[PDB]
Symmetry: C2
């Protein structure tokens, strides 16, 4: 569970010292100066004579606008951390403000501790300034390469769901979440404000949202800066906050005076947080109004007010570079030089180029430093889950009654296994669900915990399995669920979420950002220790969207995830739970894994169980397997066709086609694929099947009928250099279906058992089996018309039980 | 331009008549009866003796919970439309309340007009009940197959961006937008409330958001129903609404009394809307507080209160079916029978099984009916745009200086063309951007229009090109931009939006829903006429994300769009603008198209122009072409290698590699691909290249080096059955890059000009070209060291001009 760090939720009980605040102003001055140097300066970081256009970067890249306001907040937050001993992680929503977070880490000393070549002297500063957004150097954003970051803020919107995930089961943590006012325009951010109804102030930490109301985005004003101030406070109050508002920088108020006003507001806010935390030790059943700060300052604060007659400070024009180039003209260079001198760096750095002791005496120390706090590198907190014995959850009936036994709903087995994970690991594992945890059948967890709910309660007739603290959280928002789990992982904990397959797409771009975080981490950030994997049960899938139809039919998250499988990063798993025992084999592997996104595609509908647990774990190891017990062919050379499947429903249809083919005396081999990436080119992926193993499973030269859960294009793109790839006939989802029967869903996508029997026969010998093909094609129409006449499927389809099941016996019928 | 329909914004000036209200209660009762019949009954719709379990559907599919609340609001909306002659489209947020939208259309008489077999008598009604969510019947949701729908509501979240897009430039239209309280938990819905700062009450219509606060989602209460009522009102007021609340159904109040209170509230709300509209004719520069309605009623309203001892009315338990089976026991069947009787259908239908005249005398007639209004079938409003002459925008320099001339920023040309489309079609065409309109270089439109902004103004030094009415809209939300445009198309108008390439994935699931909407329509909804296409400029793309790095590098919308290319639907366009002339060629074609989603991938960075407009149109017709002026091989059999490209940057790299291969004496053919689906299997796609045309462009047997803009997996899966596909060496984006130089971006993805020259030589004869290959690989290293050392790219990379340009002539370089 999360460490208790420092002395949490302690009041100052004294005014902030004049000396601490002179410190904060020096910090702000040197952070701004560092921030400008990074964007503008390729050499001569301290402007030693002569300081010339020659010292300016050729391509100016970086964002000034947000930066001075981030520097101001971070200096004040550092002062606060130090005075109070407060366990603090920031979330920099405007992550394009990267130079604010690298400057922080440089100033707190974690930069040089982590990057020993970047030294606390003039030569380290020259390197520091040059490498920023520079080839061979470091990103423009508050990237994973920077100590103190758990949130890059490149794709906007996710600041609040990450802040709130972070504080979950983390009662000593405080998260100042800085939210851009443009970012507050996004849908994910807008809903993220409401997270305060889903945390508990005794058993979780505290989020202080800070709206960075600097009044502009790239080329527009922001909605929230331009509505009435009274509508702005009502909005936040309506969302369960106590809004406080600070305005500064719009007139000639001297900076010390601003710091004094701000530190005093900050302490009042903090007193209120401390009251909330103390009350919560006694009463954590009535939701408080949590403070939030409206921080209203001019965008680009402290840069030149006007440049070439254009308003710059306090404008969208300051967004990127306020001085657009300083290499082109003498006069532009001069504006740059005067801007950098305005911070009076000769008072901030010693003759050696180190920042002075009196600039940083106010800073926190040790693990309370923003860049050093372990919650910002949660891999160092994460330990292996204590897992229950996998064998305890096995579907034992395959071993007793045969392959293909039963009508289990597979995800219930993951339900029972996860419940015992939670029991063994209280406070370290969460489930999230956009109002679908019971619908995906994970509700066995309610035997040991509850849905966490901190809005009103009204009656034991409707409020079941909810309590103000619990390890399951639901809100109808894929953004919140994904974001909450991401940050729970990044702070060193574990969990799973589930979603209807088609709506996983709502968060494709979040999956992309988390994959890229992981890709960068495993490639070049070895100090950022492995975090637990983001595990996503993809269920209520395409083939069985019973109550819903066409808009709910989209298994293409497979396609999106394939765009993050390069370079042997291994940060993606794509799995098809063939049945419940395969689902156990996949879950155990994913729950042990670290630094991945695992999509575990599994059916919640009644279905056959194909494999014993031992057989599933053996299959999963390579990722695909022949099923000798299912094949009529004695070896590869004798197979007339390969019947291959990935997905619980494709496997069902392939299995049923295999019984029909057996009846016709066909010789064939059955293959099952459970890990999509086992099929990937062996030269791109050093964990995939070797060309030799692949040819052994699929044959060097027989026709391969492959029934795929998602879009056929996935498999086609993947196997393009594999032996025998030209003999693959890949069937998959084809954008057909509606509100219908199970048979009809497979029929209209050409993947039903009958069509599969026909296809195999056409691939073997079309003229010879022409009458058999024609009669299967007619039966497809007879079975559809049966569904239309009757409202349920043909008994040939529903009553089929694989020939492998002992239907002579007890409870096998 | 939108039709002015009826007599808009008129007050009643009298109480609603007791008679109109008895009609509303009857509508409510018979719509409830029709909704239950659809969910539960396969025959005997009027419960004629004997009425038994045999009349009940074997599989109960559908959603009751939201439905009686929808039916109530719709009866009352129907009374209001009749009484006022008000041009009205509803948005059904809880689109799973399909039975209400179908019930509505059956009642207003549109269903029988559109579906003549579904008659208004017993036999028609039996068919109506049976077909609902049933194999061979109609969907579970308010699908495009329903008259009156322009919003399915399958994936929740979009009710409000659609409502607001629908009213833009549509000053007589009124949109009651019904939003689920669960749906309001989603990111996209939460930011949609803010659209009231982006519309104008004189030049646009009026949305009335109606929060369907029934207290539950699937398995949970809802946040907004369980916070204090005082917070609920502050929240809506802080977002610029005047909130009004109605509560009913929680006690024994009789129904007529509920209807009287509601009609009175509705008229008061309406009078405030009429005042807002009348004031707006005089003062439209001060934003009003727009009414919204909080409609708080028990979920499942009017179903049995308890079933089997469980609370059902006023519970999440009523979400799907409140009575889970009505075939299993006599007792359950009996509950269904009593629930059906409780509406007294013996008073609602005549002996013929037609709904009686007194039930519906209060209803609206003609084009004002919810099902008949042309805004709910915008294709009948849409006319072709008046396009300016394409040749006016041509980059003429190619014709004068040669292929490869210049350093134009291609999207500026589209910007100029779009400016004059707006000028020629004022009030009929819009540009949307998530704060990226000027960034993607579409700003020439500000010469004929302005960004629409209805929040505060402060100063002409920051407020440029903004006006309270205008044809460009920006908010930093891809869900808002896509949603506004969708509904602007669905109501018969035109436009375009632009996005950074990587952040298109934010709205992948909106693209999916809209593509499924177009798929169902082109397949089987001939009466829903063609709407203009959803055109998306995808720019600031992966190869040139200069200010930004790795989070901004993801061209994978291509891969998402390929999952919607089946069945010859032709609802997807995927285009690569090779240069500004191809961009013109693509745009013209997109702007003329209907019933599509067009992705237009185009570069905003400085780049060569390859083609004349005539050549670009010619290539685009077929989608791919050989470039004979660029080839050294005289015909195919003499080609040593084919150099193929898709995308402006791949084309640039290929062309520079081709100048290098010329110098080495190599004989090669150069191919360009502008339309990705030109490559699709000719069995799947009847507009694709036939295999002959394909083999003729790509050769039947020579090596094919293909530089692709996006992920290589796309192209490989597409061409899996094409002749010569095994000889394709496809390079594309590979999840590498950071904040770095143009050359470094292509190098690290193995698609730079030097690596491509090397791959070409490896493919022809690795041993003969060993030295040259080795020299090319050393130079990739040297060109990167030069970027690290200097901060900009090697003059060999930077200074290259295609040998096809006449550099002798004065203005060519
Ligand atoms: C989802 C998403 N869309 C678009 C962008 C492009 N973008 C980068 S910065 C920015 C403006 C951000 O403004 P704000 O949230 O106000 O930050 P600030 O004024 O502090 O720099 C935009 C639109 C993005 N980064 N993320
Ligand atoms: C984006 C999205 N996620 C999940 C679902 C699954 N879903 C369908 S209905 C529903 C509950 C919605 O409740 P609400 O908006 O309160 O509608 P109502 O109570 O009026 O039936 C959910 C979660 C969905 N349709 N869309
Ligand atoms: Ca801002
Ligand atoms: Ca609801």
């Amino acid at each position: 569970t999360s460490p208790v760090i420092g002395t949490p939720w302690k009041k100052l009980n004294a005014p902030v010292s004049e000396e601490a605040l002179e410190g904060v102003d020096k910090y702000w001055r040197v952070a701004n100066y560092l921030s400008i140097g990074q964007i503008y300066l390729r050499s001569n970081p301290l402007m030693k004579e002569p300081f010339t256009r020659e010292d300016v970067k050729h391509r100016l890249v970086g964002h000034w606008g947000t930066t001075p306001g981030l520097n101001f907040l971070i200096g004040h937050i550092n002062r606060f951390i130090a005075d109070h001993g407060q366990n603090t992680v920031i979330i920099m929503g405007p992550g394009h403000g990267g130079p604010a977070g690298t400057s922080q880490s440089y100033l707190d000393g974690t930069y040089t501790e982590t990057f020993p070549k970047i030294t606390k002297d003039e030569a380290g500063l020259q390197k520091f300034f040059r490498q920023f957004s520079y080839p061979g150097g470091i990103p423009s954003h508050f990237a994973p390469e920077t100590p103190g970051s758990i949130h890059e803020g490149g794709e906007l919107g996710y600041a609040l769901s990450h802040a709130y995930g972070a504080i979950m089961d983390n009662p000593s943590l405080f998260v100042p979440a800085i939210v851009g006012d443009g970012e507050a325009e996004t849908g994910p951010l807008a809903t993220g404000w409401q997270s305060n109804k889903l945390v508990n102030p005794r058993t979780d930490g505290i989020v202080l949202p800070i709206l960075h109301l600097n009044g502009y985005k790239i080329a527009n004003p922001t909605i929230l800066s331009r509505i009435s101030d009274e509508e702005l406070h009502e909005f936040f109050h309506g969302m369960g906050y106590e809004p406080y508002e600070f305005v500064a920088g719009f007139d000639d108020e001297d900076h010390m005076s601003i710091h004094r006003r701000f530190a005093e507001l900050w302490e009042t806010i903090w007193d209120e947080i401390c009251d909330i935390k103390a009350t919560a030790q006694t009463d954590n059943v009535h939701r408080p109004f949590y403070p939030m700060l409206i921080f209203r300052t001019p965008k680009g604060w402290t840069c030149p007010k006007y440049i070439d007659g254009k308003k710059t400070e306090g404008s969208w024009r300051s967004h990127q570079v306020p001085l657009a180039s300083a290499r082109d003209t003498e006069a532009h260079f001069e504006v740059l030089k005067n801007w950098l001198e305005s911070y009076k760096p000769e008072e901030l750095f010693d003759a050696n180029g180190a920042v002075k002791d009196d600039v940083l005496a106010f800073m926190p120390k040790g693990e309370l430093r923003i860049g050093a706090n372990p919650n910002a590198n949660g891999g160092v907190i994460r330990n292996d889950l204590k897992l229950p014995n996998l064998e305890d959850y096995e579907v034992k009936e395959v071993a007793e009654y045969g392959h293909g036994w039963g009508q289990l709903e597979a995800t219930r087995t993951l339900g029972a296994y996860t419940r015992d994970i939670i029991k063994n690991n209280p406070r370290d594992f969460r489930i999230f669900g956009p109002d679908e945890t019971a619908s995906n059948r994970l509700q066995a967890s309610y035997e040991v915990t509850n849905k966490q709910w901190d809005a009103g309660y009204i009656s034991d007739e409707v409020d079941e399995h909810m309590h103000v603290s619990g390890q399951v959280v639901e809100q109808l928002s894929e953004h919140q669920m994904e974001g909450f789990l991401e940050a729970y992982l990044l702070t060193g904990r574990h969990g799973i979420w589930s979603s209807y397959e088609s709506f996983v797409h709502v968060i494709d771009s979040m999956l992309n950002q988390h994959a890229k975080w992981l890709e960068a981490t495993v490639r070049e950030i070895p100090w950022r220790k492995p975090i637990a994997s983001m595990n996503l049960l993809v269920s209520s899938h395409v083939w069985r969207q019973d109550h819903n139809g066409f808009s709910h039919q989209d298994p293409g998250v497979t396609s999106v995830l394939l765009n993050k499988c390069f370079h042997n990063d291994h940060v993606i798993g794509i799995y098809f739970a063939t049945d419940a025992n395969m689902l156990l084999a996949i879950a155990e592997k994913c729950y042990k894994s670290t630094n991945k996104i695992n999509a575990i595609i599994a059916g919640k509908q009644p279905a056959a169980t194909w494999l014993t647990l031992d057989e599933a774990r053996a299959e999963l190891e390579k990722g695909a397997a022949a099923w000798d017990w299912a094949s009529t062919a004695k070896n590869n050379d004798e197979a007339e066709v390969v019947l291959a499947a990935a997905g619980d429903v494709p496997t069902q249809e392939i299995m049923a086609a295999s019984d029909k083919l057996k009846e016709l005396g066909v010789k064939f081999k059955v293959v099952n694929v459970a890990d999509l990436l086992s099929l990937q080119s062996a030269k791109e992926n050093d964990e995939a099947l070797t060309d030799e193993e692949f040819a052994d499973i699929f044959t060097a030269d027989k026709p391969v009928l492959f029934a795929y859960h998602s879009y056929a294009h996935d498999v086609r793109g993947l196997i393009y250099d594999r032996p025998n790839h030209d003999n693959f006939n890949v069937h998959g989802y084809e954008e057909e279906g509606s509100t219908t029967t199970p048979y009809d869903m497979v029929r209209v996508n050409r993947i039903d058992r009958y069509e599969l029997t026909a296809e195999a026969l056409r691939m073997i010998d079309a003229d010879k089996y022409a009458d058999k093909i024609d009669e299967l094609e007619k039966f497809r129409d007879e079975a559809f018309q049966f569904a239309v006449d009757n409202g349920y499927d043909h008994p040939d389809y529903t009553d089929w039980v694989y020939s492998g099941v002992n239907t002579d016996k007890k409870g096998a019928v």
